[PDB]
Each structure stands twice: as structure tokens, then as C-alpha cells.
Amino acid sequence: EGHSAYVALEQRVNTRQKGIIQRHLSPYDVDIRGNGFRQIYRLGMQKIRYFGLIGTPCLLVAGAYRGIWVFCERLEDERYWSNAL
């Protein structure tokens, strides 16, 4: 791990770290249900908003393609029903 590209990068870029205090609890003292429903709600809402954002162009283009698909499908149905093939 010490001879890895990401370790080399962190040594080149980051300074010698100082003044950082981390606190960790053992999993036997942490409840798996502790922050469950709140996180479910928050993440669901976030993903709903984000997909509503980034999905709009796809929705618009899919609507245009659906219009074209309907037109072509009924054109070909009319062609087949009149022996015009």
C-alpha cells in the first residue's frame, strides 16, 4: 500500500496533517436501527429530486421518439392493410 499511486499522490499534495481528532464507537455500542427511517426518508427525497432533474431531457426526447414511433407504426399498419407493400 505504501508504494501505490494514490499514496504517492497524498504525500505530494497533502501537507503533514496536524490537529485532527477522530472519535469512533465500536459497532456493539451502535444501534443498526439508530438512524434508519430518517436516512431512508432523506435519501428517497434526494433521489426523487435529482432524478426529476437529470431525467427531464431523456423524458423529452423519449416523448418525441414516441410521437415518431406512433406515426411510423400506424403508417405501416395502413400500408399492410391496403396491400400497398
Partner: protein, 364 residues
């Protein structure tokens, strides 16, 4: 020294469940390797015994030879599904910055397409024979040395027993090279580490040990995806296939519609949307070569971030590929779908993966 085992490799904490797709693909590679080795131990490659030895010996003389065959088929299909999800995630999170990992992955993708095609050729059925014929007709369009080349590929003017035997040797050989390339894939990744949901440069205090947390997450996601996989093995065994491949090959008869497997359809579209055969070959080669990142080499290039516009365009690319596959299958009877087929193919060919910083410059 168990501690030394824990700390031999550390990753970011932002590995969402979407980062187990590589492990799922590994599971399916293992399944394909084992099932294929068991099948090959009961397989004879010839035009007089191949189709029979699959449906009359493998699937009816053994206890669960049918189960082994269904595993092989549906494992191929699910391997392709998982690999497509893997690629889509890599594009979504701007993982092209992992240059070694990306190049090895593209090589593996091309290899896996080749493996799937050659394997589908081994069931000497109607679809297998006529897919071989169509692809080789693509081959013979090469200027100058095409026809001779075709003969060398077939060992004759038609597909025959020697053709099946060489295809069998290729199908056996390639997956092991794929295994080596997977090893290289993982070696490069462990050299550069994983992106995660967001890209950060972390010191050892911000990273976590890979073992055993991520192995347990991989087991969990793998069991879920194996449930989904086995739903198809036992209850939709023939959903990822065409029934005409259960008809023994008839060189004198061509099927009504020759259609490849769902995971090769996009490539097939690139051939139907380009009228000139030579131009189609050239465009396919350029497409495959352009998925890579082998140019520039000695010009300074670096990678910037990705944004919401790019993510939305990626979703659009997915839509266009799906539409192109369906339409390229539909154009056989209805000729008015050429408009939408060509439109979708042109849209696919004009998708930006890497934002060229060279877009902006000044003239002398």
C-alpha cells in the same frame, strides 16, 4: 498476523452498493467458467453430432445437465447485463480518470463479446449457422484480401465440422485470457484505488480497511443478484434466446429474421444503419477504437470534473442505444423505421465521454 491482513489495503467510505457490480461480474465469470468446463467434457464439435449431443446427451443422460446448460446460457446473459451496468456507472462517476483500469476494461469488453459470439456458434442450430454466415459476409467486404481471408476463417466455402472445431478451440481458449485480464484490471485498480461516490484525496485516517466489511457487502449484494439470476434459470430459462436455435441447422433454408443476442444488437444496428458495407466495417472499427483512451500519448491531457448536463446526456445515450437495438430488429418488415434507426445511431455516435479542454483556444 490478522492485523497485517486487515491493513494490507484501504479504500474510501463512499463505496455505495453500486460499487459491487465488479464483484457480481466476477461471480458470473466464475459461473461461466465452471459451467463451460463441465459442458466441454461432454461436447463433440461437428455438423453431425453437435446439436444432437447437446439435446440428447447433455440434457437427457446426466442428472442435471439441463441445469448446467441453463446456468451457462443465463450466466452469459447476466454477465453482459452486469457489465453494462458497470460501464454505465463508470461513465456516470467520471471513472475514465482511472486510465489503466479503463483501458483494461475496454479490452475485456471486446474479448467478452468475442467469447459470447463464438460460444453461441457452438450450438449448431439455425440461428448459430446463419449468424456465422452474416458476420462472415461482413468479413468478405474487405478490399483486396477479403475472399481469401474468408476461406481461411472457414476452411472452405461453407461452415463445416472443421469450422465448428476451430470455433470450439477459440471459445475454450479466450475465457482464460479474460481471467488474466481481470487480474490485471484488479491490479491496476489496487494501484490507483476506487473513486467512490465523490472524488476526494484521503489520508490513511480518512480511509477504511477493505477486509472484511467490503467482502461482506459483496457477499450480500451477490446473494441478492444471484436470487434475481436464479429466477431466470429455473422459470425463464429461454427468455434470453430465440426459439429458432432449437431447430437443427439447415444450410438450404434461411430463417425469416436473423437476429443476434440482445447484448450484441447495438453493434448489429451500426451495420444496418450504414448502407455501404466497407463504410460500416470502418465505422465499427473506429467505434471500438474510440471507446479507448490511447490518444493523445505525448500531449499533455488531464481530466476535469463531471456535471449534471453530462449525466443527463448519459441517460440520453442509454435511451438511444435501446431504441437503436429495438428498431434495428424491427426494420425487417416495416421500412418506415429507418428514419428513427438512423436518427438514434447518429445521436449515439455524437455523445461526448471526455470533455476536451482543447475545445477553447486562440489562433496565431
Amino acid at each position: 498476523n490478522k492485523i497485517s491482513l486487515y491493513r494490507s489495503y484501504s479504500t474510501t467510505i463512499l463505496l455505495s452498493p453500486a460499487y459491487s457490480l465488479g464483484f457480481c461480474a466476477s461471480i458470473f465469470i466464475v459461473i461461466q467458467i465452471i459451467s463451460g468446463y463441465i459442458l466441454a467434457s461432454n461436447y463433440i464439435a461437428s455438423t453431425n453430432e453437435s446439436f444432437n449431443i447437446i439435446h440428447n446427451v447433455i440434457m437427457r443422460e446426466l442428472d442435471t445437465g439441463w441445469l448446467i446448460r441453463f446456468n451457462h446460457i443465463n450466466g452469459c446473459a447476466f454477465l453482459f447485463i452486469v457489465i453494462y451496468m458497470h460501464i454505465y456507472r463508470s461513465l456516470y462517476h467520471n471513472s475514465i480518470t482511472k486510465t489503466s483500469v479503463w483501458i483494461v476494461g475496454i479490452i475485456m469488453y471486446i474479448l467478452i463479446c468475442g467469447i459470447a459470439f463464438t460460444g453461441y456458434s457452438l450450438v449448431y442450430g439455425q440461428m448459430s449457422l446463419w449468424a456465422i454466415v452474416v458476420i462472415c459476409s461482413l468479413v468478405t467486404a474487405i478490399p483486396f484480401i477479403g475472399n481469401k481471408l474468408l476461406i481461411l476463417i472457414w476452411g472452405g466455402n461453407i461452415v463445416s465440422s472443421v469450422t465448428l472445431q476451430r470455433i470450439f478451440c477459440i471459445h475454450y481458449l479466450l475465457p482464460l485470457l479474460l481471467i488474466l485480464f481481470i487480474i490485471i484490471h484488479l491490479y491496476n485498480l489496487h494501484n490507483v484505488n476506487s473513486t467512490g461516490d465523490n472524488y476526494f484525496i484521503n489520508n490513511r485516517y480518512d480511509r477504511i480497511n477493505f477486509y472484511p466489511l467490503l467482502l461482506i457487502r459483496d457477499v450480500f449484494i451477490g446473494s441478492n443478484i444471484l436470487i434475481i439470476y436464479n429466477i431466470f434459470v429455473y422459470y425463464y430459462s429461454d427468455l434470453f434466446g430465440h426459439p429458432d436455435n432449437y431447430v437443427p441447422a439447415n444450410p438450404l433454408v434461411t430463417p425469416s429474421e436473423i437476429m443476434p443476442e440482445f447484448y450484441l444488437l447495438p453493434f448489429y444496428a451500426l451495420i444496418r444503419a450504414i448502407p455501404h458495407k466497407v463504410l460500416g466495417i470502418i465505422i465499427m472499427v473506429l467505434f471500438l477504437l474510440s471507446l479507448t483512451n490511447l490518444y493523445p500519448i505525448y500531449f499533455i491531457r488531464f481530466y476535469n470534473n463531471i456535471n449534471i448536463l453530462q449525466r443527463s446526456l448519459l441517460l440520453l445515450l442509454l435511451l438511444d442505444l435501446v431504441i437503436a437495438s429495438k428498431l434495428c430488429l424491427l426494420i425487417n418488415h416495416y421500412e418506415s423505421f429507418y428514419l428513427l434507426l438512423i436518427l438514434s445511431i447518429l445521436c449515439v455516435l455524437s455523445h461526448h465521454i471526455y470533455n476536451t479542454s482543447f475545445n477553447f483556444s486562440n489562433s496565431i
